Amino acid sequence: TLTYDDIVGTGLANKCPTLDDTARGAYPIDSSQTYRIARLCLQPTTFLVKEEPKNKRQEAEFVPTKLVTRETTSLDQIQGELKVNSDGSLTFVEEDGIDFQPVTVQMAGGERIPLLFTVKNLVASTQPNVTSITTSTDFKGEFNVPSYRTANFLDPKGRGLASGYDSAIALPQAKEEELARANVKRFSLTKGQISLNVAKVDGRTGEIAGTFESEQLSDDDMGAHEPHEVKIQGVFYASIEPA
Amino acid sequence: ELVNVVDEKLGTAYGEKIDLNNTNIAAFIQYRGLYPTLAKLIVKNAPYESVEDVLNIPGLTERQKQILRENLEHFTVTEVETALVEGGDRYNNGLYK
Amino acid sequence: AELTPEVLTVPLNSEGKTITLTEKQYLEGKRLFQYACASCHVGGITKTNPSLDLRTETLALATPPRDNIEGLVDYMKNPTTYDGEQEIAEVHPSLRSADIFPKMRNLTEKDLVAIAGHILVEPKILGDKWGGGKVYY
Amino acid sequence: QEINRRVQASLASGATLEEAWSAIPEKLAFYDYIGNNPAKGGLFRTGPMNKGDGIAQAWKGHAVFRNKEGEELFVRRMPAFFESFPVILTDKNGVVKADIPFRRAESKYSFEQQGVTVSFYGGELNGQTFTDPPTVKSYARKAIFGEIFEFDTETLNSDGIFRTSPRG
Amino acid sequence: QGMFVLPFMARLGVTGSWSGWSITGETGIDPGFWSFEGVALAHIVLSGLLFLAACW
Ligand code: CLA
Ligand code: HEM
Ligand SMILES: CC1=C(/C=C/C(C)=C/C=C/C(C)=C/C=C/C=C(C)/C=C/C=C(C)/C=C/C2=C(C)CCCC2(C)C)C(C)(C)CCC1
Ligand SMILES: CC1=C(/C=C/C(C)=C/C=CC(/C)=C/C=C/C=C(C)/C=C/C=C(C)/C=C/C2=C(C)CCCC2(C)C)C(C)(C)CCC1
Ligand SMILES: [Ca+2]
Ligand SMILES: [Ca+2]
Ligand SMILES: [Cl-]
């Protein structure tokens, strides 16, 4: 068993727990019992950004990016109710945890794409008739994506939403119409989608692990510009418990 | 047409009273008996369709119900403004002294 | 302006009684406040919780009311949250927690009376500055 | 001071507010504007004043601010020292009634809370009233500069930053 | 785009930038050192060494 001093500075703190290859079992679900996820962890391994289509209007693809904010990207210590529904499907309702990380990735050509990688208010459900969580189980769900910056955030000229100037004070007599989009901060709230594909199960401990893919918008800098579409891929871990 | 939603919200009852759905928790210090216990329950159980719905919060004492009734005149409700409630800003809005 | 007896006259209780503090009492109050309180309450604010200050109106709206000598002395013996609901001696300096807050150990009843007096008189002098924080420095 | 004197003299001779303010010459109103103050420029802000605030076209008229109770409110003017200045409205006696808050969370004086409105007398906007808070704020922001003018900012690609005059 | 030396770099196989793009429209390529930037830098350093040799 490892301590903080074993892990500190190694990068392991940003990694989700894994399960060995022998963990291909099944975790029995009792539709009479209540369940919870005690710890959900999401460790992104790849960030893809949808290229802004030239104007050919064909299929714009997701392209690779380089992480520049280091090992600060993982979601963890997430907990929430695991409902057993009438139809035998399971629904995870996220209640709390470290369920967001700001992330900046860099596109070919230098363009930096900040995003609020998140699963805030995640609601994800399995297929019906899940008597046991197996390596065939998956969760599909949606979550909220709030503004990358919150309402107090001030831009470099001191303008903000819940705080700040409401004009370009360095340009006292500039016509205000053309600066409106910059002057008037707006708070974004959009929806994201995530798939959790279970690859490993310890039927005894109640630990599951696998891969995820999520899709969400990036930062729109409080309404100053259009967000990019981001696809996040990685691995996850969850501990399921009687509660 | 671009609008600052917080400034706009100041033109509603939000600007005249404690909005149970939006106002930061420190505002409950303005009146006797609301902070921190009732303040916490109120913020935790938001949003409310009406002011009087604050009375239905589970586990409240009779004394608590009394204080709430005495202070309903100081409360309001408007639509939840994402900008004011995200980031946990209702618990800490970056304002101190 | 001067530190008149009128200025040093503060509510003793919620029932309309006042006490007139002596100049020595006021200076002692300032001294003891600096000693036991100012680490957190410099200028009337609260560094570990700026939401609650020591302004008279605020103390007045606390439960039980704290805008008088008896209330403040009681707070110094048995501190509560602003609504009076939980006792907080365990994380707040008091005679009751003088074991874990050693600077309270030698505070006398007279000392507490002095501190309370400083707390109520200061705003009558400094106005908005008291509990005002950096805005009013 | 001279503008107010003339307006008062007009009102005392039985003019309406509209008539009184419309009688104020545009040139006089134009003198009562900080963009013509020679102490508002910059060493490397080069060229004519028009390159900054624009080519003045017309006086919009005098802006009168009022709260929901109907009390007249007065915008605190920018002193020459300040590159930028807050927007603060007081009553006739200097008591604060309205402002543009920086932090909103404990705002008590927002134009929206105070239902601030603006009515124009004289100039292009004579007889018009605005009540929607964005526009009222916009005019208050211009009111910090004194009398409010319409500018051609396109002709010279004006950048909106005050420049000094040949006096300066 | 009025590019003059870029096509000559491309002609002999320099097609990518250190910043990750390539002139064929690929993304997330590693051109190694000999990107357009690497070629330019190499020429600048060469310029300097030739200057010193000229002095000698
Ligand atoms: C008394 C001298 C004087 C004055 C007061 C003016 C003033 C005016 N002229 Mg004018 N001008 C002048 C001489 C003067 N000019 C001369 C001699 C010429 C011929 C070159 C011109 C040519 C001219 C033109 C072509 C134009 C003007 C315009 C204008 C106006 C714009 C001012 C401006 O933007 O300056 C900007 C001033 C500066 C940026 C300050 C310069 C400071 C220098 C660079 C400092 C140098 C430091 C030094 C190197 C340090 C040495 C250190 C060493 C000892 C160790 C303005 C009303 C313009 C106008 O709007 O016309 C309609 C316009 O278009 N001027
Ligand atoms: C003799 C010493 C002190 C006295 C007399 C004093 C006085 C007071 C009073 C009267 C209040 C009630 C505020 C109100 O109702 O508006 C208060 C609140 C508070 N003070 Fe003190 N103060 C002292 C020292 C300290 C110290 C040393 C700390 C921190 C280390 C501290 C932290 C706090 C906190 C956290 C609160 C509010 C707690 C809550 O309501 O949850 N105080 N103080
Ligand atoms: C503005 C202009 C622009 C730009 C221009 C340019 C950019 C130019 C540059 C170019 C240059 C940049 C030139 C080059 C050069 C060089 C020279 C001509 C010099 C020389 C040599 C020599 C003289 C040296 C000597 C030496 C010494 C040093 C040492 C020892 C040895 C010897 C003696 C050899 C354009 C046109 C686009 C357009 C229009 C305008
Ligand atoms: C092979 C290799 C390469 C090629 C390379 C090149 C091409 C080289 C060149 C080199 C160079 C090109 C060098 C230069 C030189 C010389 C030197 C080493 C320097 C010098 C001199 C000096 C010593 C001077 C001194 C002084 C002066 C400073 C001044 C006056 C006085 C005197 C003169 C004294 C590549 C990349 C392709 C890749 C891989 C392979
Ligand atoms: Ca699977
Ligand atoms: Ca322009
Ligand atoms: Cl306060």
UniProtKB/Swiss-Prot annotation, chain A:
Q: What is its main location?
A: membrane
Where in or outside the cell is it found? Cellular thylakoid membrane
- Coiled coil ranges (UniProt) are none
Keywords assigned by UniProt, alphabetized: Membrane, Photosynthesis, Photosystem II, Signal, Thylakoid
What is the documented function of this protein?
One of the extrinsic, lumenal subunits of photosystem II (PSII), which stabilize and protect the oxygen-evolving complex. PSII is a light-driven water plastoquinone oxidoreductase, using light energy to abstract electrons from H(2)O, generating a proton gradient subsequently used for ATP formation. Required for dimerization of PSII and for binding of PsbQ to PSII.
**GO BP: any one term:** photosystem II assembly
Q: How is the cofactor bound?
A: PSII binds multiple chlorophylls, carotenoids and specific lipids.
Q: Which species is listed as the source?
A: Thermosynechococcus vestitus (strain NIES-2133 / IAM M-273 / BP-1)
Q: Which Gene3D superfamilies match?
A: photosynthetic oxygen evolving center domain (3.30.2050.10), Photosystem II, cytochrome c-550 precursor (2.40.160.30)
Quaternary structure, per UniProt, is: PSII is composed of 1 copy each of membrane proteins PsbA, PsbB, PsbC, PsbD, PsbE, PsbF, PsbH, PsbI, PsbJ, PsbK, PsbL, PsbM, PsbT, PsbX, PsbY, PsbZ, Psb30/Ycf12, peripheral proteins PsbO, CyanoQ (PsbQ), PsbU, PsbV and a large number of cofactors. It forms dimeric complexes.
Indicate what this protein is called per its UniProt record.
Photosystem II extrinsic protein O
Similarity field: Belongs to the PsbO family.
Name the PANTHER family on file.
OXYGEN-EVOLVING ENHANCER PROTEIN 1-2, CHLOROPLASTIC
Q: Which InterPro entries does this chain map to?
A: OMP/PagP_b-brl (IPR011250), PsbO (IPR002628)
Tell me the membrane topology, using the record's own terms: Peripheral membrane protein
Provide any one GO MF term from the record: oxygen evolving activity
From Swiss-Prot, chain C:
Q: Its topology with respect to the membrane?
A: Peripheral membrane protein
Question: Record's GO cellular component, any one?
Answer: photosystem II
Summarize where heme c binds, as residue positions: H41, H92
Free-text cofactor note? Binds 1 heme c group covalently per subunit. PSII binds multiple chlorophylls, carotenoids and specific lipids.
Location (main, coarse) = membrane
Cofactors demanded by this protein = heme c
| Key words of the record | Electron transport, Heme, Iron, Membrane, Metal-binding, Photosynthesis, Photosystem II, Signal, Thylakoid, Transport
Q: Name one GO molecular function term.
A: heme binding
Question: Where is it localised?
Answer: Cellular thylakoid membrane
Q: What happens when the gene is disrupted?
A: Cells do not grow photoautotrophically under low CO(2) concentrations.
Q: Does the keyword Metal-binding apply?
A: yes
UniProt record, GO biological process: photosynthesis, light reaction; respiratory electron transport chain
Subunit structure, per the record?
A: PSII is composed of 1 copy each of membrane proteins PsbA, PsbB, PsbC, PsbD, PsbE, PsbF, PsbH, PsbI, PsbJ, PsbK, PsbL, PsbM, PsbT, PsbX, PsbY, PsbZ, Psb30/Ycf12, peripheral proteins PsbO, CyanoQ (PsbQ), PsbU, PsbV and a large number of cofactors. It forms dimeric complexes.
Question: What does this protein's UniProt record list under function?
Answer: One of the extrinsic, lumenal subunits of photosystem II (PSII). PSII is a light-driven water plastoquinone oxidoreductase, using light energy to abstract electrons from H(2)O, generating a proton gradient subsequently used for ATP formation. The extrinsic proteins stabilize the structure of photosystem II oxygen-evolving complex (OEC), the ion environment of oxygen evolution and protect the OEC against heat-induced inactivation. Low-potential cytochrome c that plays a role in the OEC of PSII.
Gene name as annotated: psbV
From Swiss-Prot, chain D:
Q: Residues of the signal sequence? A: none
Q: Which stretches of this protein does UniProt put in the Lumenal compartment? A: 1-168
**Where does the source fall among the domains of life?**
Bacteria
Q: Which residues of the full protein are shown?
A: 282 to 449 of 510
Q: Which lineage ranks, top first, belong to the organism behind this chain?
A: Bacteria, Bacillati, Cyanobacteriota, Cyanophyceae, Acaryochloridales
Family (UniProt): Belongs to the PsbB/PsbC family. PsbB subfamily.
Q: Where in the cell is it found?
A: Cellular thylakoid membrane
Gene encoding the protein:
psbB
Query: What is annotated about its quaternary structure and interactions?
Result: PSII is composed of 1 copy each of membrane proteins PsbA, PsbB, PsbC, PsbD, PsbE, PsbF, PsbH, PsbI, PsbJ, PsbK, PsbL, PsbM, PsbT, PsbX, PsbY, PsbZ, Psb30/Ycf12, peripheral proteins PsbO, CyanoQ (PsbQ), PsbU, PsbV and a large number of cofactors. It forms dimeric complexes. Part of a photosystem II (PSII) assembly intermediate complex PSII-I; crystallized from a strain deleted of psbJ, it forms monomeric PSII before addition of the oxygen evolving complex. PSII-I includes 3 assembly factors not found in mature PSII (Psb27, Psb28 and Psb34).
* Name of the featured protein: Photosystem II CP47 reaction center protein
Q: What does this protein do?
A: One of the components of the core complex of photosystem II (PSII). It binds chlorophyll and helps catalyze the primary light-induced photochemical processes of PSII. PSII is a light-driven water:plastoquinone oxidoreductase, using light energy to abstract electrons from H(2)O, generating O(2) and a proton gradient subsequently used for ATP formation.
Curated annotation (Swiss-Prot), chain E:
For this protein, the parts annotated as crossing the membrane are 38-56
Q: Where in the cell is it found?
A: Cellular thylakoid membrane
Ranges per topology, Lumenal:
1-37
Annotated coiled-coil positions are: none
Which pairs of Cys residues are joined through disulfide bonds in the record? none
Q: How does it assemble?
A: PSII is composed of 1 copy each of membrane proteins PsbA, PsbB, PsbC, PsbD, PsbE, PsbF, PsbH, PsbI, PsbJ, PsbK, PsbL, PsbM, PsbT, PsbX, PsbY, PsbZ, Psb30/Ycf12, peripheral proteins PsbO, CyanoQ (PsbQ), PsbU, PsbV and a large number of cofactors. It forms dimeric complexes. Part of a photosystem II (PSII) assembly intermediate complex PSII-I; crystallized from a strain deleted of psbJ, it forms monomeric PSII before addition of the oxygen evolving complex. PSII-I includes 3 assembly factors not found in mature PSII (Psb27, Psb28 and Psb34).
Q: Which family does it belong to?
A: Belongs to the PsbB/PsbC family. PsbB subfamily.
Sum up the protein's function in the record's words: One of the components of the core complex of photosystem II (PSII). It binds chlorophyll and helps catalyze the primary light-induced photochemical processes of PSII. PSII is a light-driven water:plastoquinone oxidoreductase, using light energy to abstract electrons from H(2)O, generating O(2) and a proton gradient subsequently used for ATP formation.
Return the protein name.
Photosystem II CP47 reaction center protein
Record organism? Thermosynechococcus vestitus (strain NIES-2133 / IAM M-273 / BP-1)
Q: Which residues of the full protein are shown?
A: 58 to 113 of 510
